[PDB]
Design an enzyme around this catalytic site. Sequence first.
Site, PDB file in Angstrom:
ATOM      1  N   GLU C  60       0.857  -1.159   0.000  1.00  0.00           N
ATOM      2  CA  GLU C  60       0.000   0.000   0.000  1.00  0.00           C
ATOM      3  C   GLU C  60       0.896   1.212   0.000  1.00  0.00           C
ATOM      4  OE1 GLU C  60      -2.399   0.499   3.403  1.00  0.00           O
ATOM      5  OE2 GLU C  60      -3.120   2.422   2.789  1.00  0.00           O
ATOM      6  N   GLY C 135       3.992  -7.647   5.783  1.00  0.00           N
ATOM      7  CA  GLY C 135       5.082  -8.061   6.633  1.00  0.00           C
ATOM      8  C   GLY C 135       5.324  -9.542   6.853  1.00  0.00           C
ATOM      9  N   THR C 168      -4.272  -6.869  16.342  1.00  0.00           N
ATOM     10  CA  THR C 168      -4.884  -6.136  15.326  1.00  0.00           C
ATOM     11  C   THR C 168      -5.459  -6.947  14.212  1.00  0.00           C
ATOM     12  OG1 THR C 168      -2.738  -5.848  14.235  1.00  0.00           O
ATOM     13  CG2 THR C 168      -3.425  -4.129  15.781  1.00  0.00           C
ATOM     14  N   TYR C 213       4.906   3.458  19.273  1.00  0.00           N
ATOM     15  CA  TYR C 213       5.786   2.712  18.410  1.00  0.00           C
ATOM     16  C   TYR C 213       7.041   3.473  18.120  1.00  0.00           C
ATOM     17  CZ  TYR C 213       2.137  -0.587  16.959  1.00  0.00           C
ATOM     18  OH  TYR C 213       1.207  -1.600  16.975  1.00  0.00           O
ATOM     19  N   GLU C 243      29.840 -16.125  12.833  1.00  0.00           N
ATOM     20  CA  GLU C 243      30.191 -16.747  14.078  1.00  0.00           C
ATOM     21  C   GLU C 243      28.947 -16.951  14.882  1.00  0.00           C
ATOM     22  OE1 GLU C 243      33.667 -15.328  16.296  1.00  0.00           O
ATOM     23  OE2 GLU C 243      33.555 -13.654  14.961  1.00  0.00           O
TER      24      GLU C 243
END
Lengths: 426, 426, 428, 428
Positions: C60, C135, C168, C213, C243
């Site tokens: 979006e 996401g 949400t 946030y 490592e």
Amino acid sequence: REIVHIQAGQCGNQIGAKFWEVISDEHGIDPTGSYHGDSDLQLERINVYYNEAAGNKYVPRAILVDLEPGTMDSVRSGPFGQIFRPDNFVFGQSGAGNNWAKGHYTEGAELVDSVLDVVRKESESCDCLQGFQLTHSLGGGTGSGMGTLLISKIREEYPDRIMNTFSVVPSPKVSDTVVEPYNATLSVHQLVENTDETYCIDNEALYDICFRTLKLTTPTYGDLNHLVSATMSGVTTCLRFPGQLNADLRKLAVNMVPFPRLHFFMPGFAPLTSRGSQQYRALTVPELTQQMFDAKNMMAACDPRHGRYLTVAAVFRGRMSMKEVDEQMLNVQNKNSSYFVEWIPNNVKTAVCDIPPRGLKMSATFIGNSTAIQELFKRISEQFTAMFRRKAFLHWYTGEGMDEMEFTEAESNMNDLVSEYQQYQD
Amino acid sequence: REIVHIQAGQCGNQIGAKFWEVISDEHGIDPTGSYHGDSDLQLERINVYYNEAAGNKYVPRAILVDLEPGTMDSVRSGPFGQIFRPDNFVFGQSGAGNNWAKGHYTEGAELVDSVLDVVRKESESCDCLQGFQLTHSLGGGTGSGMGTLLISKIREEYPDRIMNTFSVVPSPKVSDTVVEPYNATLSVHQLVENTDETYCIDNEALYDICFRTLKLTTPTYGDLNHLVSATMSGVTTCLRFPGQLNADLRKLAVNMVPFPRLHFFMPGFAPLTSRGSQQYRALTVPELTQQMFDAKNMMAACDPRHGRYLTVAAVFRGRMSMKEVDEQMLNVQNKNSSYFVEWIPNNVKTAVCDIPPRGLKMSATFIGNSTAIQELFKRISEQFTAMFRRKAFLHWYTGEGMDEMEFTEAESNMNDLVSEYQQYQD
Amino acid sequence: RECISIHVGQAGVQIGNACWELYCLEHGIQPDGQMPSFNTFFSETGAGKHVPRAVFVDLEPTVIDEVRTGTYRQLFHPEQLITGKEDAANNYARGHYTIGKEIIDLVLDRIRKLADQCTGLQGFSVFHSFGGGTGSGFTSLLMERLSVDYGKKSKLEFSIYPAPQVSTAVVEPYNSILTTHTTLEHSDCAFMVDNEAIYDICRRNLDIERPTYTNLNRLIGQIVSSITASLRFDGALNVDLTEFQTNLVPYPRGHFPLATYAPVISAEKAYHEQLSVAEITNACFEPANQMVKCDPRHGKYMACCLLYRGDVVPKDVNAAIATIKTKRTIQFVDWCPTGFKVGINYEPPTVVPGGDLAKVQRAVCMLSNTTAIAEAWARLDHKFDLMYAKRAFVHWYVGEGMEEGEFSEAREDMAALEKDYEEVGVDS
Amino acid sequence: RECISIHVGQAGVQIGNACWELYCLEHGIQPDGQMPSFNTFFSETGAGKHVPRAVFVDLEPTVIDEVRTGTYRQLFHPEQLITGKEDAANNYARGHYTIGKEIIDLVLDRIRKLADQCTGLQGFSVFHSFGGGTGSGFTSLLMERLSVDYGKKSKLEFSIYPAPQVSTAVVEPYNSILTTHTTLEHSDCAFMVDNEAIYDICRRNLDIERPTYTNLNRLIGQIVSSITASLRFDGALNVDLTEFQTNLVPYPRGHFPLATYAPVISAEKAYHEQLSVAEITNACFEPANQMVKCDPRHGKYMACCLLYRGDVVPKDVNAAIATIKTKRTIQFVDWCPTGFKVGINYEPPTVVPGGDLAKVQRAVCMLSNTTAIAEAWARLDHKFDLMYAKRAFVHWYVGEGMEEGEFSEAREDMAALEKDYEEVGVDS
Ligand SMILES: Nc1nc2c(ncn2[C@@H]2O[C@H](COP(=O)(O)CP(=O)(O)OP(=O)(O)O)[C@@H](O)[C@H]2O)c(=O)[nH]1
Ligand SMILES: Nc1nc2c(ncn2[C@@H]2O[C@H](COP(=O)(O)CP(=O)(O)OP(=O)(O)O)[C@@H](O)[C@H]2O)c(=O)[nH]1
Ligand SMILES: Nc1nc2c(ncn2[C@@H]2O[C@H](COP(=O)(O)OP(=O)(O)OP(=O)(O)O)[C@@H](O)[C@H]2O)c(=O)[nH]1
Ligand SMILES: Nc1nc2c(ncn2[C@@H]2O[C@H](COP(=O)(O)OP(=O)(O)OP(=O)(O)O)[C@@H](O)[C@H]2O)c(=O)[nH]1
Ligand SMILES: [Mg+2]
Ligand SMILES: [Mg+2]
Ligand SMILES: [Mg+2]
Ligand SMILES: [Mg+2]
């Protein structure tokens, strides 16, 4: 590059009156013939339509012809009568009575020979003719009769020049005379063999435009003939002014005629909407193409979507990008592909020039060649047969000397044209 | 990202009038369409609801439709009539008489085809439609009839776009027409299959809000339709302005619909109290959540606590912390867990954006989906059966051509919806 | 020894916003790109402008537009700001396929461009949520393609863990579980962080009334730079990303270390306080400072790595370790004797102007592989079960083409994962 | 080592307009002809006025008049501005014969005049469209006569390829096919360019909303000068037109290299970007920067030549080549081992005032002989078939004297051409 225009009959006389008004507006020519323009380009191709008279005055390369003095006088009395020279007023004194036989076959022929001599004079004054333009009716005596005689003689003398004509097409809702289909049939018969192209405009559709889109309660010929003149001037804008694509009418003819006998066109126009909404308009090419595609903005009384397109020509005026126009018109074909004939990839051709119409930023003229047109021929042929079968009123033409077979064959050729549209349709 | 809004019937026309008023206020658009805003963000997503017309003027992406000219004219006469283009006024001249059969089935269909062409035109002008919004009544002839026809045609053309509608729900205390349940039943039957969601607002509850909380002695539709518009604008605030959570309506749809057929919603709103007490207010998120949870501030005439919640959506406007909102709404579920359905952990979802409503520091819109809603369907179905059993007035619809089974099946589907709420209830 | 940062969704982008802001703060980078001074994250143009080696993707436009309107828009190259036209509706089906599949090729090629710009790419880090669409779903798609062309490069993922409080999306469990599987399939190390635990730290150690946030991202961003910038800058005991792979993953599946960070103290409470290396590391072993909602005392340890910034001496660390071993309640699994890795940079911790944390002279990042992570998985499994029992909302994925068995499958895979953590925790 | 530029039709003339404007910009030529400074393209008069060695022909006055009214009309000699009185109606029959045949003798003699003015003519370049009349048909006529008197001089042709999108004549396929044959018969190298691919570059790399021909021509003009002006000016590795013949045409028929060009980046996107020699050449092998609508990844390579402007070092080119060989997907045909030719000038790329592209420090022109060109031919063949199946519009040529078999013939010749490209692509 020059064009000789001839106005035949009241239709021709009044539509042409508006046409010449517009053309002089295009070039900054006042009603006296004096040039007071804005640009150099206004003069640069003024020769297509004008002669330069002493004193920087211009004379329209066109002949006004009729059989009734009154009409001719009324045109001459208005603005732009002054711009015409006396040499271009050719007329008689007794109309044809709406009889093609009187116009074509007898009486009109008498004037036609003098008209042709004036035509010749003008073609001699020209450097190189591009073509001829006639404005006339399909149903009247001099408009269809006399005018078609004149056409056969002009094409005879100038085989490679472009003969085009604009003409008013009968409709069930318009029809004045009972023999109007008879006149139409006879003219069609001749026009299909003797012209390179003809534009089919129907007053019915024009009235709808005037009310529906232009929001006029009283459509008048003064405005109706205005709309026609817009389209008539549109087709030679590029010819007259620099641009990018397709200026020449012959080029357009090449791209618009896939078959020698199918040369009837559907003109339309954008933007075409009343002022009330203009404040909410935002002209873009998509906007112009939306209006030009939409059948409601066609000047011909025929919806293209009922048939299928063979060719589309779009002429754009004013500064638009190449992409915008070429993408959008491609998209028209893409989105409405079902209404195009598959024989021609890329049915839509465009012309784009750099000079906009006075008052608009951009404008577009639509020329269609769709098989839907056959419907107009059906209206005529059908009405014809009803009359013809009974021979109602025929005696008025047989009085002139017309043969039943002359009409029979005329019908035959009309039937051929419809069948050819059907052959290409699908 | 764009939305096409359609106003159907007086309800639709007047509620939408307030809606568009508000939306222009949101973006700084004056009644002429000119932008005089405050922020860049006002323009940044103006495209959802507007077209930019030449001169930085905007046109609302919405169609006004009815069968009575007078209504349409009254809307056009007010502010914001000027912002609408003539192209969006589609109407006839004879109302439906409150008959779904006349609106849906017969007469309204005649206009619907022209409406749809305008719809298509607008969807073509859009870059990417997000969805459609309709505002209409559940009991009127064009509001429920015509509007539902229109919906079936739009969803048909745009299956993946969000179809939502806001509509006025009949109540025992409101009921005007005897066949109002008949119209409602028929519309419900169609809406349950053809929409993605519908908001159920009841004038009764709205009147109670106006007096009880807003302390008005004379609730008027001008204010009642104002409250609705608040909630209508609330749901696309985030869409239009930057924020943090859930801007998209589809996202909301995903989170609010657990089962395809249960798509009826209970809108509510905070802050919602008269000025007298406002001086003692102190808006905090707990304050907003207290008011939004409280059934008295619901716009739907139904108390959620009588049933059980399937989903809750809360949309917050203005600068609030993440914690405050997420803690407090969690706490609502925690404290009132007995009214939530145990299937969904975390029944409350939130949306939070950064732009407050003009005049408030913060605001919150409530969307509920509780099984309590079935009561509204009971009111309708019950009343229906009483009429239907005797066929009182039925002849007016059978006169149009409606079949007893058409109504019978419509009832059946209403009964299904109630049973499904009961299945989820407990 | 360069890297690429990939930010997907608003969670990834907004976190990224703070991350690049922090990188600017670490090296004195102006918003215009001008910087007089980090080449692992930036490339330089002939103008002396430096460009963040990162790609921002949002299906979006909205969030990307926010980036485009912010001050750092002059830092970012326009080609790195990629957007779609519609979100995934919080739904993997769209994120991973229906919508995201139409953009992902652009994205990958911009990544390639950056990959070709780098000379010695060590790897890359990705930021996103578990519960979103873009996401999670888009991210899955992305990792499928990146492991094809890059393979072996480091795949670090930072995932936001859905909290019970904040929720949400109702189908977050479903979104998360689908994602999880794919991260198991293609990431090298996944770090999940719980905004609810973070809030708790902000309200108690930073003393913040109302966390947002923006404050949460600052904290995370600093942690991420303490892992990477700190490797790039060199210190005493530099510790490479390879490592971490070698030391933190005992078996191919146990790639889920969690992060804890200290000092997380407000300026006001920092006055007066001075923490030693040992004291900060004691804070790092406290559950109360854990950025994930779980109990470290419950689980066992398998691997632990402590990274240091600023003023730290190895000797002090050695003492601190002894203290952790002796104080604690650090039940390490037999399978790993002693597993504490120490990286020490000299680069001091940095402070964000207008920040919420005190300026500190030394800072410690704790990474750890503990069996307590299963706890979080158990919570998600349960939530899934509830939704899936009814099959509420299932049509929003199925209607987009998903298969019922796909959901069953993914859950089962998580169950196996948790069981594998059990097994490793079983001493042998 | 001089040359002549021939511009026919509006396509040739309008492109030429930008070309000579560019030449003015390259050497500081005033519109009046005064120039203080290119002798390959200009001759000098005793007034210190320089005159473009070119001939502009348009069978319709219109476009030439545009030239005559523009600023560069003082640069052009009146005898070089030749016009007819009527166009070819988009029709080869008229262009090649009926009309064009009446002017062509004038044209050729003006060419001779220039040929006599040159002392050591290397050759000449012609600009026109494939679909027009004058541009295609007249052009054919012209080449028939030029190969008689000049023969052996370089015959470079730049032809505009009709796009499916833009189509301005329904008989374009017919026009194009007739032309094609004659170009096969008399050109040495034909470069066809698709305005639709160019538009795509302008909208994406130059970020132009609404491209016009004026912008399109600027791009092309610069490419053409990068091939020629760049040879005239001397650099490091100068590459003559005769070397292009020698190196780019494996068999007498395969004379159709295509062009790709980079950097094609807007000023705004160029900030921040710096491209190395290798990076620009990577852009040159991307289909997205190809000026012809075809797929370079589909076809195979036979010949490739890279020309460089400005700041380029042979070593960097050597590395870039290795990269192309290794990165790519440059399937070269067995028939040619390794075929990469490199020309490097020192002359920097130039910028048009009021231009749309960024100022660049190095620029790369890619010429290439690839089998993908057949694709374009296939599209034209099909279109022909459709028109010819019905025989729609055929009377517009036949009525001007053309023979049915002539059209059949020309198509067949193209089919043979495509088949020859197939054959060369077949490895052996
Ligand atoms: N759009 C317009 N159509 C017209 C106009 N005048 C007439 N007509 C139409 O043309 C046909 C009638 O023709 P005219 O006036 O042109 C007849 P004309 O004077 O050519 O010949 P006569 O038979 O000698 O009268 C008919 O379809 C009328 O309806 C006009 O001013 N505008
Ligand atoms: N909250 C509001 N409800 C309204 C309003 N006007 C009407 N209604 C309600 O809507 C239903 C009556 O409908 P309308 O005015 O919308 C009928 P409509 O004009 O759509 O169709 P016709 O049958 O052709 O008249 C009913 O429940 C009224 O009580 C309004 O302005 N606000
Ligand atoms: N720490 C942190 N968490 C965030 C931020 N923004 C969102 N989140 C969390 O990430 C999840 C939200 O994902 P969304 O913003 O809904 O979606 P998305 O992942 O960006 O992609 P779409 O669903 O397609 O919009 C929630 O669990 C939020 O609590 C942020 O800026 N910082
Ligand atoms: N790049 C570019 N292409 C052009 C330009 N002008 C025209 N074209 C293209 O060339 C073709 C047009 O040829 P025309 O202008 O119709 O004709 P002509 O070749 O000049 O000759 P005539 O047909 O006799 O007028 C189309 O394919 C156009 O897209 C220009 O200035 N630049
Ligand atoms: Mg008359
Ligand atoms: Mg009404
Ligand atoms: Mg998002
Ligand atoms: Mg031309």
